[PDB]
Amino acid sequence: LDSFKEELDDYFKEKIVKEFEKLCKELISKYEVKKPTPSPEIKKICEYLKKKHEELKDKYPEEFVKEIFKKMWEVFKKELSKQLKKLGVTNDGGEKYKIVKEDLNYLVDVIKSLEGLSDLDLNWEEIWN
């Protein structure tokens, strides 16, 4: 059934996001802005996303994978936003900012190099707002 596949699609979506949401809550809340870049927590998030994409590619259409990786991107930005305010890191041209910017470029490259995700809107500048 149509009506019902849509309901379960959203159910599996919600749970795929929650699983990543608790990963990020656990890693980003202990993220500290220091070299070496990429940071271990960023790498861990990168390996989870490389793992989940290949596993999701097997079994969902192109459009659904992109929607899930949009939501995970949103969830990551919101978690990183609150950790950066906890630390006092702002977009002020300093080394703490550049370190965050290297980590995030590394992350966005990873996500964009996944098949079907290269055109995702992966801007992050609102994490400072």
Numbering used by the authors: 3 to 131
Provide the authors' own sentences about this structure as they appear in the paper.
Other regions in the spike S2 subunit, such as the stem helix and the segment encompassing residues 815-823 adjacent to the fusion peptide, are highly conserved across sarbecoviruses and are recognized by broadly reactive antibodies, providing hope that vaccines targeting these epitopes could offer protection against both current and emergent viruses. Here we employ computational modeling to design scaffolded immunogens that display the spike 815-823 peptide and the stem helix epitopes without the distracting and immunodominant receptor binding domain. Unlike peptide-based immunogens that can sample diverse epitope conformations, epitope scaffolds are meant to present only the antibody-bound conformation of the target epitope on their surface, which typically leads to higher antibody affinity and the elicitation of antibodies specific for the structure of the target epitope.
Given the failure of side chain grafting to produce epitope scaffolds that engage the CC40.8 mAb, we employed an alternative design technique, termed backbone grafting. Here, rather than transplanting only the epitope-specific residues onto a preexisting scaffold backbone which is otherwise unchanged, an entire region of the parent scaffold backbone is replaced with the backbone of the secondary structure containing the desired epitope. This allows the grafting of more complex epitopes that have no existing structural match, such as the CC40.8 S2-helix epitope. Next, we optimized the sequence of the S2hlx-Ex designs using ProteinMPNN21, a recently described deep learning algorithm that takes a protein structure as input and generates amino acid sequences that are predicted to generate the same fold. Analysis of a high-resolution (2.3 Å) crystal structure of unbound S2hlx-Ex19 further confirmed the successful transplantation of the CC40.8 mAb epitope. As expected, the grafted epitope region in S2hlx-Ex19 diverged considerably from the backbone region it replaced in the parent scaffold (backbone RMSD = 5.8 Å), with the epitope adopting a more exposed conformation that allows for antibody engagement. This conformational change was likely facilitated by introducing two aromatic residues (Tyr62 and Phe66) under the epitope helix, which effectively pushed the epitope segment away from the rest of the protein core. Interestingly, the epitope conformation on S2hlx-Ex19 was almost identical to that present on the prefusion stem helix, rather than the more extended one induced by CC40.8. Nevertheless, given the high affinity of S2hlx-Ex19 for CC40.8 (KD = 6.7 nM), it is likely that the antibody can readily induce the necessary conformation upon binding. Interestingly, the stem helix immunogen S2hlx-Ex19, which bound with affinities for CC40.8 and S2P6 similar to those of the native spike, displays the epitope at the N-terminus of the scaffold.
